[PDB]
Design a protein around this ligand. Structure first.
Ligand SMILES: *[C@@H]1O[C@H](CO)[C@@H](O[C@@H]2O[C@H](CO)[C@@H](O)[C@H](O[C@@H]3O[C@H](CO)[C@@H](O)[C@H](O)[C@@H]3O)[C@H]2NC(C)=O)[C@H](O)[C@H]1NC(C)=O
Ligand SMILES: *[C@@H]1O[C@H](CO)[C@@H](O[C@@H]2O[C@H](CO)[C@@H](O)[C@H](O[C@@H]3O[C@H](CO)[C@@H](O)[C@H](O)[C@@H]3O)[C@H]2NC(C)=O)[C@H](O)[C@H]1NC(C)=O
Ligand SMILES: *[C@@H]1O[C@H](CO)[C@@H](O[C@@H]2O[C@H](CO)[C@@H](O)[C@H](O)[C@H]2NC(C)=O)[C@H](O)[C@H]1NC(C)=O
Ligand SMILES: [Ca+2]
Lengths: 71, 71, 71
């Protein structure tokens, strides 16, 4: 705009005023991290801050990607 | 900021969330392709497995025998 | 036989049980010692901290000031 602008955020992001600036939330379950080790893949809830068991008794893992709920 | 500490066996971090991959991106493929329908800017293209070629005169059907999807 | 698999940061396995350390082994020390009462085959001995020596003529009391046990 003429000497002005808006920090709008796209669909699926609720505007949430935060500390040291404003951001937009995740509009759903807090993100997990996937953490692959040679023998297992581990999950971690970024909000709950707890590991939980996932793929185990494996060997020589190296990299990870995912498809969100295909079915 | 530090989040957490894991094995030197750690090989990735990946955020497992749906907003991370926009699910409402329509596939331009018209099901015309016989085996593979790769993407390209503003459209798609046909291809067939390695060590095979298109049936002469056509850019869709390839001579390699089709295989059933895995259950 | 294998038991479990864990980080290359593993440094030791130690069995935490009471039968591994016979608890009914009586300490031969007669509380005579001033600071330390070390063991030896069939008996015990007196000693005092580094940079200190026994009071002349005695093999029990040492010149270093005693310190209260830590809570
Ligand atoms: C994920 O990708 C989809 C597209 O596959 C994005 O949807 C589009 O988002 C724009 C943003 O403002 C909307 O306008 C689109 O709506 C459509 O707009 C055109 C004109 O440009 C009209 O002709 C259509 O009738 C319609 O109103 C919208 N399109 C669709 C198909 O939804 C989406 O924003 C994006 N999401 C994220 C999180 O990246
Ligand atoms: C842990 O150490 C204790 C000793 O500090 C062991 O106890 C002794 O075990 C023997 C095994 O047969 C018993 O005889 C002992 O009983 C006494 O033995 C003396 C002879 O040395 C006799 O004169 C006594 O009349 C009496 O029979 C017993 N001593 C005590 C004080 O209990 C114990 O076995 C050991 N446990 C393990 C698991 O190693
Ligand atoms: C990660 O942790 C968050 C909490 O920080 C979970 O969110 C809650 O999950 C319960 C599950 O029954 C829901 O009923 C609540 O409504 C959720 N609360 C919020 C703040 O939305 C979340 O489910 C956890 N995800 C995983 C997979 O562990
Ligand atoms: Ca402006």
């Amino acid at each position: 705009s003429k000497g002005s602008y808006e920090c709008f955020c796209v669909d699926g992001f609720k505007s949430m005023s935060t500390h040291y600036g404003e951001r937009c939330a995740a509009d759903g379950s807090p993100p997990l991290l996937l953490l692959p080790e040679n023998v297992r893949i581990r999950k971690y809830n970024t909000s709950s801050e707890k590991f939980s068991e996932y793929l185990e008794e494996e060997e020589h893992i190296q990299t990870i990607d995912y498809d969100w709920d295909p079915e | 900021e530090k989040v957490l500490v894991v094995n030197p066996w750690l090989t990735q971090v990946r955020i497992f969330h749906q907003l991370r991959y926009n699910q409402s991106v329509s596939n331009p493929c018209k099901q015309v392709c016989s085996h593979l329908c790769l993407l390209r800017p503003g459209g798609y293209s046909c291809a067939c497995p390695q060590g095979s070629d298109f049936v002469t005169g056509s850019t869709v059907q390839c001579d390699a025998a089709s295989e059933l999807p895995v259950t």
